[PDB]
Amino acid sequence: SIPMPAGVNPADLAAELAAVVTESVDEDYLLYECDGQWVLAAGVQAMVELDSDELRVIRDGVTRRQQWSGRPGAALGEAVDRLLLETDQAFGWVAFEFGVHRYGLQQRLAPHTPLARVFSPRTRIMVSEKEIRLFDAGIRHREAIDRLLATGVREVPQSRSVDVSDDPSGFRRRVAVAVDEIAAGRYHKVILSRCVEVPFAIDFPLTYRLGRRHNTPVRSFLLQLGGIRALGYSPELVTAVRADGVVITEPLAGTRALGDLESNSKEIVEHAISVRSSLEEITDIAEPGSAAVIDFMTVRSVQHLGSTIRARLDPSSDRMAALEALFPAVTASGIPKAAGVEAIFRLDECPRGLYSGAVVMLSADGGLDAALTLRAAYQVGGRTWLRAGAGIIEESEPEREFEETCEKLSTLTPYLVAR
């Protein structure tokens, strides 16, 4: 537990710790901000990689490859439990496609489709306004820290800007297809998204730093995990399983990122429907008659409308089954919902993996924290990109909807800090 350098910013320090502890070895990590603390999950001890076709578990070099069966939630939950046999915490992410088995569409998935990535770290480093607390940092890690503390944080260099004016994934066309199916009665809402590719490469922690000062979110992350970098300001708690069995879900999580009771009556309609279907979903997973909506349509700094749902797990269900049962999020797929997910397969670039999935932290005490994530930046190999969507309804218009996503994109776009 060390004091903070004074006039040095927690996020900046935390993002600079990720860079140093990485250039040091060649370590994967997950920087995670939460209500006011950052956590850096530093090393990799073990990794669970759940794909569409296989389970892989990777330890001290060797991979263990295996087939798995129904409900991805159970296959993952078992792997995660073995991971936490001898460690407290795990971190990773779960893909949109994780919720796809439920509505029977796993077949539509290409042979190696990421479903989830979970790992136990070699080090947790908590970073806050008053202090830095270190859990299980060996010599290698603390020298890095002492080294960053010797120098200070780098200055953020000039940011470079992307031109989100054009398509050409044909978000325009695709929205108009969605509007047509909504008019035919196929479903009532779907969320379509749009990728903007970034020519120059991002330096991630440095792009994360700049964007963090210019955005101000509820949760934020930065990672380097599979062969994937990601960075976001959009995450919100959707689902949490407490150590004592109680499940919390947050049915309107993501309306915040997704943006007279006569006007906002669409919003109230969608609020009710989405509340109701999640109460339906959670019940399929809970002690009979333990499910309740405890806070309902209350104005919960930004103001998105809110509801909280509470349940008790079982005897017989897993925390990951809770997640699945509630995945994917109503607000990031559509309503009816099955119809939205299936619409997304037809009308959006697929797989989404991570865009509309999310973060996920787990505890050996039995806890789970999962946070839907939308707007983020991603890098896999040579392509770096942004992804943002909008919710398309009966009265939606290609143009307005497109400029909608333009506005959502520039909470990232001017902050792009090149390598």
From Swiss-Prot:
UniProt-annotated binding residues for Mg(2+): E270, E401, E404
UniProt entry tagged with the keyword Isomerase: yes
Catalytic residues as annotated in Swiss-Prot or TrEMBL: E236
Domain of life: Bacteria
A Pfam cross-reference name: Chorismate_bind
Disulfide partners: none
Function: Involved in the incorporation of salicylate into the virulence-conferring salicylate-based siderophore mycobactin. Catalyzes the initial conversion of chorismate to yield the intermediate isochorismate (isochorismate synthase activity), and the subsequent elimination of the enolpyruvyl side chain in a lyase reaction to give salicylate (isochorismate pyruvate-lyase activity). In the absence of magnesium, MbtI displays a chorismate mutase activity and converts chorismate to prephenate.
Listed name of the protein: Salicylate synthase
Species annotation: Mycobacterium tuberculosis (strain CDC 1551 / Oshkosh)
Lineage: Bacteria, Bacillati, Actinomycetota, Actinomycetes, Mycobacteriales
